[PDB]
Write a protein that binds this ligand. Sequence first.
Ligand code: HEM
Length: 137
Amino acid sequence: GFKQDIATLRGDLRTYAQDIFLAFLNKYPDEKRNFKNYVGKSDQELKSMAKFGDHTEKVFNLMMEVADRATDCVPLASDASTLVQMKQHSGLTTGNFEKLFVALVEYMRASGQSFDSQSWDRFGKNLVSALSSAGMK
Ligand code: HEM
């Protein structure tokens, strides 16, 4: 289920993190404009850029902690506030996070592994709701 999925992803996190984030950037090409130096690069070129590997790993390291601390796929309000107050996320909206979780769920459904994709769909929706209550537009 959800808790085991966290362990599965953490077991090979750098690979899953890059694959899922690329699936997100390729399903929603306009999201690349939020990052410097991503436009005009193929997947393999992005994976060889230092800031891509660093950001993607940090995103998933923290996302797995937020998921680990959640109850019934509902994140802690404190975790949502932390994500809102990051200066890095100034200018972002709940829509950016919504699209990331759509790509993540689609990736799980196509992987063929025993992911609990329905619980991750709920988690993404519940996280977006928490971000809104925390102050994100
Ligand atoms: C669960 C969701 C997310 C988590 C946990 C997360 C986490 C993080 C963390 C920890 C950093 C700073 C890393 C460091 O200081 O080394 C960061 C930076 C950043 N994040 Fe997020 N992030 C999430 C979603 C997103 C989304 C959806 C976007 C854009 C669509 C985004 C865009 C950025 C940008 C632009 C930066 C700083 C500039 C850069 O690294 O290129 N993040 N994020």
